[PDB]
């Protein structure tokens, strides 16, 4: 059961990954810095 | 068996927001107020901390008081803030100025009637009232002045009930406020007469808890207030869940307090351990007791090794055997016998509760009455004596109206408290 | 229509509370740090 | 000097039978022989 | 797996629990063994006879083992499923097969919801086994007002 | 025939839960109060009558009351599995606990609830035709058990008079301890219990823990095991009322035979075939081995060593397939031993009982199934050491008035502490005089 | 059992328009006069306030009087104005000038005969006549003078019936009229001899009701007149609907007035609460009883904490248990026993009516007889004595024709009323 819980937590982290990257693009970070930043986010 | 909570000042309101988050989580109440729990055991004692609204909703039995609305607006803006009853928010229009005498005498008497009307209205609705629970700092302005004012009024109006306080106290290394010794000394003077039991926590000790035990890289006040909210919700757990050996705030007081002035206690919470390490060690009673008594895990700067235990209490949550609890408390008392006061044959009370907090197999909270608390009072009295001979900042308080004899009385009474602790520490049967 | 309004009000309130609670963890604090840095570098570039 | 105290809520039933919320709070008086 | 043909072997309203456990937290080796064991009991004879062995002690051991296992892990089994699993345990199951069956169904059954210590296997309602009670030693108070009562019968 | 059970406080209610589970399973009453209906009629039966009464539709209801000051444990009983067995009036609950204060139980809070309890007990005693005693289960270490137990036994003793009252009592263990104020409550309890009880059986949790570690193979015991063992003991003593036998034993012969002088009423309890199921199938369990077992201190359920004292009387209860001649051969062999000593004024040291009903097996239980068992109750001067050590702990606390302000605040004079402690001092002096061998002319 | 209403002056006519709107709405009468209700319970007591005109129609039993038709034209132009009988509007050609003597003596005696003729024509048509009901302000000119004139004439002509008045009285902080003390003193002097029952309301207390309890941002006179119409229509509810414990105006008078001069009462209506707060607290009989005695909810500036209750009455509308009522009235009497006059063994009467006001599940109106009303009379008498010693505006009244001895008589009567309240407040059994 503990393994199931941590897997779901990691999935939630991926979801907030996508949401935060989209929000950051919405604010208006310049494209080259945004690309380098999202590359170092992995 | 229901408690009424009061949260006063910035520290009290901030800790309170996390406390009511923890309690709402424990009873499965959605932040909209709808019950969404998954066992009847959650519902059957919801009355203890919540009042019932009609359709879905539950409302939390708490009064919020502050002198500037900034904090109140912050808690209302928080994720659970809507649950609080709007008529229960009481605030003024100008600050305490970090001054005890202004906060106690000028705006205190102006606001105090409106807080008592709400507190009495909430108390008199209960079918049987258990003690009050108050969170505040002693070093502040509204915390010290309005907390002790309200404590005195509730002790006048309900002298047969229990009065319980949680209190934050100044660190030994760095001050957050310049005038901390005056506010602390006057507030402890008020508490030792008025209060029944007062708990003290040092923020420096919480930082050391976080860094050594939890190893957080970048802790925030949310973490410190989560640790505090966890223990606060834990002490009352046996009041509000079934168990093999029930306990009660009054039952704690009768077993913990040997003499009525000796009611200041130390705190710790045991199953703190990082999520990475938890895979390497299963929970068991020897592990919990060994971690539980390690001074690394105790939430005050004073260390037990300089004093002796008069009494202690341990409240266990989880499904566990009584044999291991009893024999561990015997072995620990026998092996470290010089640190336990010898004219009491067994210093530790145990209690066992069936329902642990979610995601931990077991937990214990520890309550300790130890004489090493005397060094804190001595240090505060020293700093007070340095400030008082020269009236270093005294004109603010005297301009509000206090006579200096109040300051000399409070110093003398605290010094006598230190003497009483020292005499009982070195007493012997002869 | 009152039932529909009540349900949608609960849905919005619950979603707001949920997204407010999710920033109390510790990964999100470091990610706030890194977005501030991205922001700090970009504003600095414009200043030159 | 005593402030006004508005009335209280009715007491709930602790169990079937008993004098928890009745009009007469005291159950009865035991009579010693004599 | 085969959802349609497995209704009567299990209880009526447990399909969602089986689906949730199989999809979400079932390990790969665990689910391999799960479908293997489900297949191997699902084909058992509904009226297979008792095993025959040269030792009566071994026969008693096997029968009591099957009875204990079925009375234990049959929390959500049906009567036909219980009978088939009992016959498989006595006849076809090996040591590792029994160990794997227990490993599967201990996680399949459980729920991990906290409950009070008295209700936790201290005071459960016992099954129907009151037959066979030795009734030859209880007292009998004879009735003097009715000589034809069942009370006076020796 | 009939007996009424009174359960007080937390230990007494939980032991009651274990007792009524056992008594139900032995008679065959289903938890809804009925009996199976598919069996042949045969002839009717009456053994339940000691513990149950029937209304007339054939539902069963038990002759018990549950008394507690906090709601939680009785509400747990109300919501559990046996909800329909008990009459709801029987489950009596107050508002708030006695907080380890004898004064709180006796003067302020128990005084409100006690008259309802007495009215319920009266309603029970009116529905009887051969009542032959009260059984009481309580612990003397806690506040409500001490205070309300004393008040209720005093009232029962005035109203019912001569009727016998037998107590099963959990005393504070000599070094395992659970609360600080245990000595005060135990002394003040013992003062009231001295006047108003006919036999008191003493139990210590440390002994049942030792017995479950050494004899049973249980690494992590909990209160349910101990409470089920106590229930088995009570079932053994009350079996003599309920089943056919060679030598029956009514509850009044215990009281007449075990107590030599009116203050000398505290008895030791032990149980012989405490054995695990895996050992039980490797061994026969004949009469002489279990008779030898009940006198070994490894068999006792109270933490005292009888080798430091002298026996005054022993009562041995055998149940199951036993023959009187074999019990006689065993008891004569025990009597020969030199490390077993009787006071020289007690030549006929033994009472025997022989019952045909073997001990019952509980589905979740930890005892093995055995064809025979023996249970022993004995009166011995070694018990004087337990009171002396409790009194010593009292002297340690009272020398500095360590906690007295709670008791004085809840309504009690400080003088009452000294009177009770002096009465227990007189009990030690009584145990010194009664225990002195013979006399002299000068 | 039918009541006849009279509305006099601007305040009386405005409150009356809202009263007849509320009553016509409650019985389902269309503003054309057609019955459109949906239960027989509405029809079976319609006679109490309405007379029946031919083919279906109902007409409301009210007399309208004013000295300038401006108000009459405003009420006639209102949404329900058409219902009123044309012959029932009586008006002059010049105003009262806010002068009691002018309103009573010069235009009063000129018009008064036509008002008595209409009231007698309406009264003699009834099969059995119950009391009259009058709404007016005491601070005005035509309201005070002609209201008390008409009261005196009706008490001469119908001395065996009941006389009931609802009256608006001057705020303690701001005057609406400069000559308020004279007009108030003379009108209260007339009422205390002539009246059987008089109701008093402070506009300042209704404003504080709106702002503190209802938190209205921009209240208007329509709201104030709705609160008044709610209490007014509540007092008569037991006259006109079935119930478990019926009550009557005479039954109210017999239980409320211990001695004949002490007949001035305070009013409140309980389920007032803002739309935002209503989600946090459900309606129940304990909640109504707790709110009902809170001085925040009382419609006068005097607070109960400065006096003692001689008697009180509560009229409940709704489906509710008598048990809850009985324990609420016992608990309030026992816990606050010092604020209740001790030589009366039970001060509160209860009554229960089946039919609540529409859109509320239940409602209660509270009537209280409290000695703190004496502070109002002392204040008005003080201001009168300050003005009279200096002849501040007396020439207007003397020019109309008043003898100066009337003012000294009215002052003496107020001083004796204050003395009687003060003596009964501090009386004891001895
Ligand atoms: N054998 C056994 N002993 C118990 C049990 N529960 C508590 N005890 C013991 O009894 C003593 C505590 O007494 P309690 O029954 O908890 O006291 P109480 O009757 O609840 O009195 P209050 O605390 O005022 O409510 C300790 O010595 C415990 O070890 C139990 O379930 N079984
Ligand atoms: N644990 C905790 N302590 C706090 C918090 N905020 C302030 N403090 C402490 O409280 C003291 C300041 O008191 P304060 O709340 O400002 O007093 P007030 O001005 O009367 O409200 C200092 O010791 C701070 O370190 C908080 O959120 N959590
Ligand atoms: N509550 C309320 N009070 C009013 C209303 N109209 C006037 N008043 C009050 O009544 C007093 C004035 O009396 P008024 O009616 O003008 O006397 P009149 O000139 O003789 O008619 C003042 O205190 C006003 O505030 C109203 O519609 N509602
Ligand atoms: Mg208890």
From TrEMBL, chains B, G:
BP-aspect Gene Ontology terms: microtubule cytoskeleton organization; mitotic cell cycle
Its protein name is Tubulin beta chain
Q: Where is the Tubulin/FtsZ 2-layer sandwich domain?
A: 245-382
Please state where this protein is localized.
Cytoplasm, Cytoskeleton
The cofactor named in the record is: Mg(2+)
Q: What is the protein's known function?
A: Tubulin is the major constituent of microtubules, a cylinder consisting of laterally associated linear protofilaments composed of alpha- and beta-tubulin heterodimers. Microtubules grow by the addition of GTP-tubulin dimers to the microtubule end, where a stabilizing cap forms. Below the cap, tubulin dimers are in GDP-bound state, owing to GTPase activity of alpha-tubulin.
Protein family according to the UniProt entry? Belongs to the tubulin family.
Give every Tubulin/FtsZ GTPase domain span: 46-243
Q: Which Gene3D superfamilies does the record match to this protein? A: Helix hairpin bin (1.10.287.600), Tubulin/FtsZ, C-terminal domain (3.30.1330.20), Tubulin/FtsZ, GTPase domain (3.40.50.1440)
Automatic annotation (TrEMBL), chain C:
The UniProt entry's coiled-coil ranges are 4-48
Residue ranges crossing the lipid bilayer per the database entry:
none
Out of the domains of life, which is the source? Answer: Eukaryota
Q: Where in the cell is it found?
A: Cell projection, Cilium, Flagellum
What family does this belong to? Belongs to the CFAP45 family.
What protein name does the entry list? Answer: Cilia- and flagella-associated protein 45
What gene name does this entry carry?
Tb08.4A8.180
Automatic annotation (TrEMBL), chain D:
The domain of life is: Eukaryota
Instruction: Write down what this protein is called.
Output: Uncharacterized protein
**Gene behind the chain:** Tb03.3K10.230
Coverage of the whole protein, first to last residue?
A: 101 to 134 of 350
Automatic annotation (TrEMBL), chain F:
Q: How does it assemble?
A: Dimer of alpha and beta chains. A typical microtubule is a hollow water-filled tube with an outer diameter of 25 nm and an inner diameter of 15 nM. Alpha-beta heterodimers associate head-to-tail to form protofilaments running lengthwise along the microtubule wall with the beta-tubulin subunit facing the microtubule plus end conferring a structural polarity. Microtubules usually have 13 protofilaments but different protofilament numbers can be found in some organisms and specialized cells.
* SUPFAM superfamilies on file: Tubulin C-terminal domain-like (SSF55307), Tubulin nucleotide-binding domain-like (SSF52490)
Q: Which residues form the Tubulin/FtsZ GTPase domain?
A: 48-245
The family note in this entry says: Belongs to the tubulin family.
Cellular component GO terms, alphabetical: ciliary basal body; cortical cytoskeleton; cytoplasm; microtubule
Origin species: Trypanosoma brucei brucei (strain 927/4 GUTat10.1)
Pfam families (alphabetical) = Tubulin, Tubulin_C
Q: What is this protein called?
A: Tubulin alpha chain
| UniProt-listed GO biological process terms | microtubule cytoskeleton organization; mitotic cell cycle
Instruction: Report the catalytic activity.
Output: GTP + H2O = GDP + phosphate + H(+)
**Protein's job:** Tubulin is the major constituent of microtubules, a cylinder consisting of laterally associated linear protofilaments composed of alpha- and beta-tubulin heterodimers. Microtubules grow by the addition of GTP-tubulin dimers to the microtubule end, where a stabilizing cap forms. Below the cap, tubulin dimers are in GDP-bound state, owing to GTPase activity of alpha-tubulin.
Looking at the record, the residues that make up the Tubulin/FtsZ 2-layer sandwich domain are: 247-392
